[PDB]
């Protein structure tokens, strides 16, 4: 019944619009398979289309906004695109129809409406691009009856091992088709839907824009060669209409031109299922999925006061659909340095110059191929899996579909190498590499990242203790199933735990350092003079200079998080020998956190280093780092230290802004310095941890109950309203928020952990 729930899950989630890197496209969860993609662009001139065409997501003044209004990866959803440059408000409805043996069917409607600014007679080129990889697979455009292209629907017939037989139909659609009176129409038609079937080597099929353009260019070249010139040129839109040449191949370009508003449908029908999908099916299934989304939201994301209002409901729906709608399937090679150069051991003073020398050797090679099913921080900027990010992405996702969240966890944990390492950044394939500068591509086996994924596991454990509907919760409703999942994953958790202790170990025994345990001390590998990327807080101030004797209180607290999870799960599995080891370790971290990181002078936790005279010095920078033992739920509710941190959290002269907790205190000397990335701005993921922990303390007998309750109340209010106001004004979730103005800044479309705001509003932790 485990293999059984897993098969149903496979079959449920197989198809989706799993390529978040482009405005609209589909692929299944198979590395080499069938993929689709949308492109559109107005054409006003002979040279304009190349600049107007849209394919991959970006964010600039050209594009007012875009994102999912509703989305469930099991059912589908609706996306809105507001394109200023192209004068177009576009809608992409995508829906899945279960049935057959090949992971169901699906269908999409593309609607375009000219906005009030656009010339009512705008010409907009639309393209649907279809590709197939695999050695023993086939795809054919059925030719049209008419000479120059299609009056009606385009039908592609295809077969593959993974998909069996299928047909994919691009319908004729509603909208005016411009007609050309030029001579050229004697050879190219007056204007009509056209199909070009091509073949390239598989590994380049992803490069839709160049492949399209190569075809467009050959078309213009043809015109020049056949004496169609400036003496009397065809209309631009006719110049960019491809000559119709359907056939078979691994690429199929379907192209339409519309004047004014337009719409058309894609109907993918698995032959494995019953009758083929129809447009009338698309309409029904879309309507029904909306109703299902509606019900589920109100049940799973019941917004509590003061956010019960519809305005906040719309807000929550937008933040949630954009987070979950970013889910993607990625496939390909990673770039990894597998040298394990000794300089990465970072055992010297000046180690950053050593590690740069080993990097300068360029031993990194491609390896894999790998696959990952994951949500993502940002469609336009960061369309790929980030390890500690996903920790936050999955917390609301888990509420919505726990079976979904566990798939994504499973997916992430399957990338782990024999040592226990998962690269913090998953760049899989040439496609995924295209949106990443060479400098950032290479992964390093010594670089960790917060194990925020254990948080989600924690929530599942607590839920496990206490057909699309059924599937979504099968892993808590069937305890046998839950446990079996944990049994299989547990080895990997423990592996990773040990990997932290082998690779991220701090140096006690070699200095003047007394403390309750000889074992417990952690230091992030990977740090440079001004950064510690691996920690998540890229430019939070750390001991200067960086130094092999550093200890990092955030890292130690993360290890804390892991052991608490390991206790819970080991118990559930009865790994008794294990659960005793964990208990001794937890005990030691609790003590060592105090002995090695607590500053009575300053009233908070601190990183450590070793002095010029080789003695242990605390280095205190009051901000997120300083709160870590508390954010990670390690502190006893009656602790004087907890209470001292509540003073810090609440104190407006340090971290308490009207808009949330500042990453760094106004008092610190690094406040608003350098890039000011984690050096003042409000970050929603770290605020979320605080809000959750405050609520913990508030809902328990203890000396800090009523202080916590008040901070909770205000922080929840502050964070939500800041994100909401910004959403209202700008349409976007932002990466961080400005503590002085409340303005969102850095990156847009960050959903992304900002979306955590949905869970914050719904409350009752
Ligand atoms: O959310 C992810 C991550 C969190 O894990 C961290 O905690 C947080 O501190 C930072 N974030 C975000 C993050 C920030 C920087 C990088 C690398 N720089 C980089 C520079 C330019 C591009 N471009 C892509 C398209 O446009 C032109 C070029 C892309 C990347 C990666 C992620
Ligand atoms: C889905 O099923 C196929 C065939 O049974 C299998 O190759 C694949 O591993 C499954 N996908 C995963 C692991 O998500």
Residue by residue, DSSP assigns 547-576 as -TT-B-HHHHHHHHHHHHHHHHHHHHHT-H
Collapsing DSSP to helix, strand or coil, 209 comes out as helix
For residue 379, the CA-to-ligand 1 centroid distance in Å is 11
CB-count burial class (<10 Å; 0-12, 13-18, 19+) for 555: buried
In terms of Cβ atoms closer than 10 Å to its own Cβ (0-12, 13-18, 19+), residue 458 is middle
- Distance CA(654)–CA(661), nearest Å, equals 9
Question: In Å, how far from its chain's centre is CA 88?
Answer: 26
| Gap between the Cα atoms of 154 and 132, Å rounded | 17
Residue nearest to atom 13 of ligand 1 (CA): 382
From the CB of 102, is ligand 2 less than 6 Å away?
A: no
* CA-nearest residue, atom 3 of ligand 2: 10
Q: Which spans in 414-478 are helix H?
A: 429-433, 453-465, 468-477
* Bridge partners of residue 619, in order along the sequence: 607
Q: How far is the CA of 60 from the centre of ligand 1 (A)?
A: 17
Q: Is 538 a catalytic residue?
A: yes
Q: How far apart are CA 417 and CA 5, in angstroms?
A: 27
DSSP category for residue 275: S
What is the distance between the alpha carbons of residues 182 and 169, in angstroms, rounded to a whole number?
Answer: 30
Q: Which helix (H) or strand (E) holds 693?
A: helix 684-698
- What is the Cβ-side half-sphere exposure of residue 688, based on CA atoms within 13 angstroms? 25
SS (H, E, C) 481-503: HHHHHHHHHHHHHHHHHHHHHHH
How many Å lie between the centroid of ligand 1 and the Cα of residue 538?
Answer: 10
Please check whether residue 599 is in contact with residue 618, taking contact to mean a CB–CB distance below 8 angstroms: yes
Which ligand lies nearest the alpha carbon of 406?
Answer: 2
Nearest atom in ligand 2 to the alpha carbon of residue 13 is 14
Asked whether the beta carbons of 33 and 132 are under 8 A apart, the reply is yes
Give residue for tokens 């995924």: 432
DSSP string, 698-744: HTSSSTTHHHHHHHHHHHHHHHHHHHHHHHHHHS--EEEE-TTT--E
Closest by Cα among 134, 131, 152 to 143: 152
Quickly count helices (H) and strands (E) in the chain: 21, 26
* CA-based torsion, 176, 182, 188, 189: positive or negative: positive
Q: Is 764 exposed, middle or buried (0-12, 13-18, 19+ CB in 10 A)?
A: exposed
589 backbone φψ class: left, alpha, beta (φ>0; ψ -120 to 50): alpha
Measured between alpha carbons, how far is 121 from 261 in angstroms, rounded to an integer?
9
Closest ligand to Cα 427:
1
At residue 723's C-alpha, the angle toward residues 293 and 396, to 5°, is: 40
Work out the number of other CB atoms within 10 angstroms of the CB of residue 274. 12
Ligand 2, atom 12, lies closest to the CA of 10
Sign of torsion over alpha carbons 12, 170, 163, 416: negative
- Indicate which residue of 538, 587, 590, 595 is catalytic: 538
Pocket of ligand 2 contains residue 716 by CB under 6 Å: no
b/e for 193-221, b at 16 or more Cβ within 10 A? bbbbbbeeeeeebbbbeebbeebbeebee
User: Which pairing describes strands 138-141 and 123-132: parallel, antiparallel, or unpaired?
Assistant: unpaired
**Closest ligand 2 atom number to CA of residue 411:** 14
Declared resolution, Å: 2.7
Q: Which of 60, 386, 449, 683 to mutate to test the pocket of ligand 1 (most atoms within 8 A of CB)?
A: 386
Given ligand 1 and candidates 437, 441, 528, which is best to mutate, with the most ligand atoms within 8 Å of its CB? 437
Ligand 1 pocket test: pick from 381, 527, 681 the residue with the most ligand atoms within 8 Å of its Cβ.
381
d(Cα 697, Cα 712) in Å, to the nearest integer? 10
Q: Ligand 2 centroid to 412 CA: how many Å?
A: 15
Q: Using an 8 Å Cβ cutoff, are 517 and 485 in contact?
A: no
Q: Whose CA is nearest to atom 10 of ligand 2?
A: 10
For residue 330, give both structure tokens: 């990625």
Angle between helix axes 387-400 and 279-300 (nearest 10 degrees) is 90
Report cis status (omega within 30 of 0) of the bond before 306.
yes
CB atoms within 10 A of CB 600: 9
| d(C-alpha 578, C-alpha 566), whole Å | 9
Q: Which two tokens stand for residue 301?
A: 């994301």
Cβ proximity of 593 and 605 under 8 Å = yes
End-to-end CA distance of the chain: 31
Would you call the peptide bond into 572 cis, given omega within 30 degrees of 0 as the criterion? Answer: no
Give break positions in the chain: residue before each, C–N beyond 2.5 Å.
466
Return the CATH number of the domain spanning residue range 328-503.
Answer: 1.50.10.10
In the reported structure, the alpha carbon of residue 381 is separated from the centroid of ligand 1 by a whole-number distance in angstroms of: 7
Strands 604-605 and 25-28, bridge-based pairing: unpaired
What would the two tokens of residue 729 be? 């004004």
* Residue 440: Cβ within 10 Å count: 11
- Verify whether ligand 2 is closer than 6 Å to residue 29 (CB atom): yes
User: Relative to the alpha carbon of 9, which ligand is closest?
Assistant: 2
3-state SS assignment for residue 406: helix
b/e map of 232-271 (b: 16 or more CB within 10 Å)? Answer: eebbbbbbbbbebbbeebbbbbbbbbbbbbbbbbbbbbbb
CA–centroid distance, 382 to ligand 1, in Å, is 6
373 Cα–ligand 2 center, Å: 12
Ligand 1 centroid to Cα of residue 309, in Å, is: 34
Residues 6+ apart with CB under 8 A from 243: 188, 194, 196, 219, 222
The residue nearest atom 25 of ligand 1, judged by CA position, is: 381
Which ligand is nearest the CA of 379, by number?
A: 1
* Distance, CA of 720 to CA of 754 (rounded, Å): 10
DSSP secondary-structure letter at 754? Answer: G
For residues 762 and 765, give the distance between their C-alpha atoms in angstroms, rounded to a whole number.
Answer: 9
Separation CA 137–CA 150 (nearest Å): 25
What is the per-residue DSSP string for 94-159?
EEEE--TTTT-EEEEEEEEEE-TTS-TT-EEEEEEEEEE--SS-EEEEPPPSSSSSBSS-EEEEEE
Domain residue spans in the chain?
2-277, 328-503, 505-620
CA-to-CA distance for 174 and 185, rounded, in angstroms?
A: 22
Token readout for 438 is: 């060479």
Look-up of token digits 């009575």: 600
* Spatial separation of the C-alpha atoms in residues 351 and 198, rounded to whole Å: 52
Q: How far is CA 720 from CA 144, 325, 649, 684, 733, in A?
A: 55, 21, 17, 9, 11
Closest ligand 2 atom to Cα of 14? 1
- Is residue 542 lining ligand 2, measured as CB closer than 6 Å? no
Mutate to test the pocket of ligand 2, among 7, 10, 411 (most ligand atoms within 8 A of CB): 10
3-state secondary structure of 323: helix
Who lines ligand 1 at CB under 6 A?
377, 381-382, 386, 388-389, 435, 437, 440, 536, 538
- Could you tell me the CATH superfamily of domain 2-277? Glycosyl hydrolase family 63, N-terminal domain (2.70.98.110)
Q: Which ligand is nearest to the CA of 410?
A: 2
3-state secondary structure of 233: coil
* Closest residue by CA, ligand 1 atom 1: 377
- Kindly give the pairing relationship between strand 604-605 and strand 607-610: unpaired
| CB 660, CB 719: distance < 8 Å | yes
- Interval between CA 104 and ligand 1 midpoint (Å): 36
10 Å CB burial of residue 368 (0-12, 13-18, 19+) is middle
Closest CA to 53 of 131, 127, 163: 127
Q: 17-29 burial string, b = 16+ CB within 10 Å, else e?
A: bbbbbbbbbbbbb
CA distance 626 to 605: 5
Within 207-278, where are the H helices?
Answer: 208-225, 236-239
Q: Which of 370, 672, 528, 44 is nearest to 52 (CA)?
A: 44
Q: Can 2-277 and 328-503 be said to share one CATH topology? A: no
Using CA atoms, how far apart are residues 139 and 202, in angstroms rounded to an integer? Answer: 14
Cα 21 to ligand 1 centroid, rounded to whole Å: 14
CA of 7 to the centre of ligand 2 (A): 8
Question: Treating both helix axes as pointing N-terminal to C-terminal, what angle do 2-13 and 402-413 enclose, rounded to 10 degrees?
Answer: 90
Ligand 1 atom showing the smallest separation from residue 536 Cα: 7
Q: Which residues of 606-629 are buried (b: 16+ CB within 10 A; e: fewer)?
A: bbbbbeeeeebebebbbbbbbbbb
> Are 415 and 370 within 8 A, CB to CB?
yes
> Distance between CA 200 and CA 35 in Å, rounded?
15
Q: Token pair of 336, please?
A: 């990894």
Q: Is the Cβ atom of 10 under 6 angstroms away from ligand 2?
A: yes
Our answer on whether the CB atom of 101 is closer than 6 Å to any ligand 2 atom is no
SS3 of residue 240 by DSSP = coil
- Which of 261, 346, 539, 735 is labelled catalytic? 735
> Could you tell me if 51 and 42 are in contact, meaning their C-beta atoms sit under 8 angstroms apart?
no
For ligand 2, the distance from its centroid to the CA atom of residue 10, given in whole angstroms, is 7
Burial of 331 (0-12, 13-18, 19+ CB in 10 A): buried
DSSP-derived 3-state class of residue 35: strand
Atom 8 of ligand 2, nearest CA residue: 10
Atom number in ligand 1 closest to CA 389:
5
- Active site annotation includes 310: no
Burial of 737 by CB count in 10 Å (0-12 exposed, 13-18 middle, 19+ buried)? buried
Residue 9 alpha carbon to ligand 2 centre in Å: 10
Widest pairwise Cα distance in the chain: 91
Query: Which atom of ligand 1 lies nearest, measured to the CA of 377?
Result: 1
**Which of 616, 665, 659 minimizes the C-alpha distance to 645?**
665
Q: Are 257 and 179 in contact (CB under 8 A)?
A: no
Q: Is 518 in the pocket of ligand 2 (CB under 6 A)?
A: no
Atom of ligand 2 nearest to the CA of 414: 13
The protein residue with its alpha carbon nearest to ligand 1, atom 24, reads 381
DSSP state at residue 277: P
Whose Cα sits closest to atom 30 in ligand 1?
A: 436
């Amino acid at each position: 019944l485990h293999s059984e729930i897993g098969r149903l899950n496979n079959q449920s989630l197989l198809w989706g619009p799993y390529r978040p890197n482009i405005y609209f496209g589909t692929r299944p969860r198979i590395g080499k398979s069938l993929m689709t993609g949308l492109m559109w662009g107005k054409i006003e001139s002979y040279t304009d289309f190349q600049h107007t065409v849209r394919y991959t997501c970006e964010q600039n003044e050209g594009m007012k906004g875009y994102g999912w209004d509703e989305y469930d990866p099991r059912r589908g959803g609706i996306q809105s695109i507001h394109d200023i440059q192209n004068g177009l408000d576009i809608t992409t409805s995508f829906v899945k129809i279960p049935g057959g043996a090949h992971g169901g069917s699906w269908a999409a409607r593309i609607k375009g409406t000219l906005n009030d600014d656009a010339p009512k007679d705008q010409k907009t080129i639309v393209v649907f691009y279809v590709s197939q990889e695999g050695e023993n697979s086939e795809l054919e455009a059925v030719p049209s009856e008419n000479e120059f292209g299609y009056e009606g629907d385009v039908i592609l017939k295809g077969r593959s091992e993974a998909l069996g037989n299928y047909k994919l139909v691009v319908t004729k659609g509603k909208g005016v088709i411009p007609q050309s009176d030029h001579d050229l129409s004697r050879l190219r038609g007056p204007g009509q839907t056209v199909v070009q079937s091509l073949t390239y080597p598989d590994e380049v099929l992803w490069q839709a824009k160049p492949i399209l353009f190569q075809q467009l260019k050959a078309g213009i070249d043809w015109l020049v060669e056949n004496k169609y010139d400036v003496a009397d040129p065809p209309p631009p839109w006719q110049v960019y209409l491809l000559a119709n040449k359907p056939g078979s191949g691994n690429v199929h370009i379907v192209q339409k031109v519309f004047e004014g508003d337009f719409e058309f449908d894609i109907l993918f029908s698995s032959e494995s299922a019953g009758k083929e999908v129809t447009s009338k099916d698309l309409e029904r299934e879309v309507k029904q999925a909306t109703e299902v989304f509606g019900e589920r939201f109100a049940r799973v994301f019941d917004l509590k006061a003061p956010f019960q209002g519809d305005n906040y409901k719309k807000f929550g729906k937008s933040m949630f659909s954009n987070l979950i709608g970013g889910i993607g399937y990625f496939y390909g090679h990673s770039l990894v340095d597998r040298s394990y150069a000794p300089e990465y051991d970072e055992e010297n003073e000046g180690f950053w110059e050593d590690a740069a020398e080993a990097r300068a050797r360029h031993q990194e090679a491609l390896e894999g191929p790998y696959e990952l099913f994951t949500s993502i921080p940002s469609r336009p900027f960061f369309p790929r899996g980030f390890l500690w990010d996903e920790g936050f992405h999955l917390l609301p996702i888990a509420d919505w579909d726990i079976d979904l969240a566990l798939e994504i966890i499973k997916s992430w944990y399957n990338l782990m190498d024999e040592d226990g390492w998962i690269a913090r950044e998953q760049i899989l394939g040439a496609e995924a590499r295209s949106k990443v500068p060479k400098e950032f591509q290479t992964q390093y086996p010594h670089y960790a990242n917060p194990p925020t994924l254990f948080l989600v596991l924690d929530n599942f454990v607590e839920r496990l203790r206490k057909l699309d509907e059924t599937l979504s919760t099968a892993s808590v409703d069937n305890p046998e199933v839950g446990l079996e999942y944990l049994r299989r994953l547990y080895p990997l958790l423990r592996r990773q735990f040990d990997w932290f202790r082998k690779t991220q170990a701090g140096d006690i025994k070699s200095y003047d350092r007394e403390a309750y345990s000889t074992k417990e001390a952690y230091r992030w590998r990977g740090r440079t003079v001004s950064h510690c990327l691996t920690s998540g807080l890229d430019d939070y101030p750390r001991p200067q200079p960086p130094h092999p004797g550093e200890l990092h209180v955030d890292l130690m607290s993360w290890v804390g998080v892991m052991v608490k999870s390991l206790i819970s799960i080991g118990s559930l599995l009865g790994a008794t020998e294990d659960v005793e080891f964990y208990t001794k370790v937890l005990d030691a971290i609790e003590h060592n956190l105090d002995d090695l990181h607590w500053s009575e002078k300053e009233g908070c936790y601190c990183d450590a280093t070793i002095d010029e005279f080789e003695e242990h010095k605390l280095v205190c920078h009051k901000g997120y780092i300083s709160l870590f033992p508390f954010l990670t739920g390690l502190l006893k509710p009656d602790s004087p230290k907890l209470g001292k941190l509540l003073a810090l959290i609440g104190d407006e002269s340090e971290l308490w802004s009207p808009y949330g907790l500042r990453s760094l205190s106004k008092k610190d000397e690094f406040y608003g310095t350098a890039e000011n990335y984690w050096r003042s701005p409000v970050w929603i993921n770290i605020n979320y941890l605080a809000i959750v922990q405050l609520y913990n303390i508030a809902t328990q007998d203890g000396p800090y109950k009523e202080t916590a309750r008040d901070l909770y109340t205000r922080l929840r209010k502050n964070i939500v309203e800041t994100v909401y106001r910004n959403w209202e004004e700008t349409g976007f979730a932002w990466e961080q928020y400005n503590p002085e103005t409340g303005k969102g800044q850095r990156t847009q479309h960050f959903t992304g952990w900002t979306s955590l705001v949905v869970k914050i509003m719904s409350g009752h932790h």
